[PDB]
Amino acid sequence: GLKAAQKTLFPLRSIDDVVRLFAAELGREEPDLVLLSLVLGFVEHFLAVNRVGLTYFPVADLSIIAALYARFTAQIRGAVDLSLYPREGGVSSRELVKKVSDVIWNSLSRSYFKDRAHIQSLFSFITGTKLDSSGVAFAVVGACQALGLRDVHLALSEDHAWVVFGPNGEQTAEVTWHGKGNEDRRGQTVNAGVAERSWLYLKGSYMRCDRKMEVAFMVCAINPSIDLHTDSLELLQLQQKLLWLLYDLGHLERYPMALGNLADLEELEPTPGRPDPLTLYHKGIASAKTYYRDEHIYPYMYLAGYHCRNRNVREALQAWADTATVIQDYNYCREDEEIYKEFFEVANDVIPNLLKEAASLLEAGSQGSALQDPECFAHLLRFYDGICKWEEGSPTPVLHVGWATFLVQSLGRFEGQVRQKVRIVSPVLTFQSEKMKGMKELLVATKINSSAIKLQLTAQSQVQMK
Numbered sequence: 001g002l003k004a005a006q007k008t009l010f011p012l013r014s015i016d017d018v019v020r021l022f023a024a025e026l027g028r029e030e031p032d033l034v035l036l037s038l039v040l041g042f043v044e045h046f047l048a049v050n051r052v053g054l055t056y057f058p059v060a061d062l063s064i065i066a067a068l069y070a071r072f073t074a075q076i077r078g079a080v081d082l083s084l085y086p087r088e089g090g091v092s093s094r095e096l097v098k099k100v101s102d103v104i105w106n107s108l109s110r111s112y113f114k115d116r117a118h119i120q121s122l123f124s125f126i127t128g129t130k131l132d133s134s135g136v137a138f139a140v141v142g143a144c145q146a147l148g149l150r151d152v153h154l155a156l157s158e159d160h161a162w163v164v165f166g167p168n169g170e171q172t173a174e175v176t177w178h179g180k181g182n183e184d185r186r187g188q189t190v191n192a193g194v195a196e197r198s199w200l201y202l203k204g205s206y207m208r209c210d211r212k213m214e215v216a217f218m219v220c221a222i223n224p225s226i227d228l229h230t231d232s233l234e235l236l237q238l239q240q241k242l243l244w245l246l247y248d249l250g251h252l253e254r255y256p257m258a259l260g261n262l263a264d265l266e267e268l269e270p271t272p273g274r275p276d277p278l279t280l281y282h283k284g285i286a287s288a289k290t291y292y293r294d295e296h297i298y299p300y301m302y303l304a305g306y307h308c309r310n311r312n313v314r315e316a317l318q319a320w321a322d323t324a325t326v327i328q329d330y331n332y333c334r335e336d337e338e339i340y341k342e343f344f345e346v347a348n349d350v351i352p353n354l355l356k357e358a359a360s361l362l363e364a365g366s367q368g369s370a371l372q373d374p375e376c377f378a379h380l381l382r383f384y385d386g387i388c389k390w391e392e393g394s395p396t397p398v399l400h401v402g403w404a405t406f407l408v409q410s411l412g413r414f415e416g417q418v419r420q421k422v423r424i425v426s427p428v429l430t431f432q433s434e435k436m437k438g439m440k441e442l443l444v445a446t447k448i449n450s451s452a453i454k455l456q457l458t459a460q461s462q463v464q465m466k
């Protein structure tokens with residue numbers, strides 16, 4: 001190693017002291033990822049993993065943080081000999097990046113729960129020899145910075161992480177695992193995944209982080225959870241303040257999900273004088289549209305979740321329809337299972353529960369109910385249309401009869417006189433999927449033909465013999 005200027009703020013005695021440290025690092029040529037992750041993991045460990053003895057804030061003494069930093073840098077420098085991998089051009093090689101990845105991987109405990117909380121940071125790597133998937137990729141980037149490899153940067157999709165490096169930062173390399181059971185492609189490019197138009201690789205519209213965005217990633221990666229019931233107020237506040245610092249300095253401009261995280265925090269505990277959560281969610285969506293060709297799903301899911309929690313049914317449906325309008329131009333691939341699970345939950349649990357409550361409130365006399373609004377019925381139909389279109393040309397199917405039951409139920413929540421008002425053109429809606437085009441006459445009928453809907457959604461050819 002640490003430079004003298006990096007040590008002057010220690011000891012860190014409060015949240016605001018940590019925020020100062022992040023401010024100073026972010027004002028530097030290159031913020032120190034190793035330092036910052038070690039601090040965050042330290043504070044998270046003593047605020048969420050083990051709060052014994054806590055009286056206000058776990059003081060971060062320099063002697064402690066410098067010793068952790070020395071354990072990291074020693075481990076990396078000792079195991080990665082740079083002289084074996086000459087840098088033609090001030091850029092790194094694939095072999096060098098692979099060696100760093102191997103080093104991190106080989107340092108990890110043989111067996112542990114890979115999905116635990118609080119194993120994302122370099123503090124976890126040093127003290128527990130444990131990291132989660134994306135934590136490995138972050139550690140590889142941290143290790144590369146510590147080695148002077150200024151070209152190696154973190155790349156992020158909505159459910160995976162890897163690195164970019166080399167001439168013009170144009171190379172990609174896998175450095176960690178994804179999911180559970182996937183035979184890894186460590187050392188390879190992501191170009192096959194890009195080419196198959198999976199959600200996992202975002203058709204190539206993934207985030208290529210600069211150092212400032214890598215700091216934003218570690219801040220999103222703070223995990224305030226103490227247990228299933230309980231969050232650390234101190235960590236929530238630290239994460240919120242750190243996200244505002246990044247925001248003010250411009251470093252969330254290209255980070256849609258960080259804006260959604262900040263909006264969620266503001267909904268929980270709003271900061272006087274700051275934009276509303278809704279404004280923040282829409283800024284996330286604008287970031288996606290500006291930098292990522294509007295090919296991200298979470299900016300709309302964050303918005304829908306907010307509307308859902310606030311029982312803005314119309315606005316939740318619109319936002320879900322918007323998520324489907326994104327997913328429709330992907331192919332559903334092996335390894336996209338996380339987004340399939342989220343779509344499944346929305347269609348088959350969340351929406352039905354919202355419409356069930358809406359129907360009770362309608363019986364009680366609500367006015368302006370989603371169930372009386374043809375534009376809400378349009379949103380519902382646009383949601384299913386994108387899911388159907390997503391499925392077209394995919395190497396695995398999406399829909400099955402489990403989805404059909406909930407579709408029939410959700411349609412039936414709207415009276416025919418409401419459903420009949422939606423104009424399906426070849427409130428006005430255009431269908432992109434052949435499944436929904438063929439369902440058009442069934443959708444606007446007084447009595448919902450349940451069997452015919454099922455047959456159309458699942459393309460089941462035949463009904464019961466006997």
Ligand SMILES: COc1cc2[nH]c(C#N)cc2cc1CN1CCC(Nc2ncnc3sc(CC(F)(F)F)cc23)CC1
Binds near residue numbers: 134258305308
């Ligand atoms: C499963 O989590 C969610 C499901 C949700 N459904 C709806 C609706 N309707 C809203 C909603 C919100 C969430 C919360 N989830 C949103 C995504 C967020 N993920 C992220 N947030 C910031 N940065 C990154 S980088 C990355 C890929 C990587 F982990 F590195 F491999 C993921 C990710 C973590 C929290």
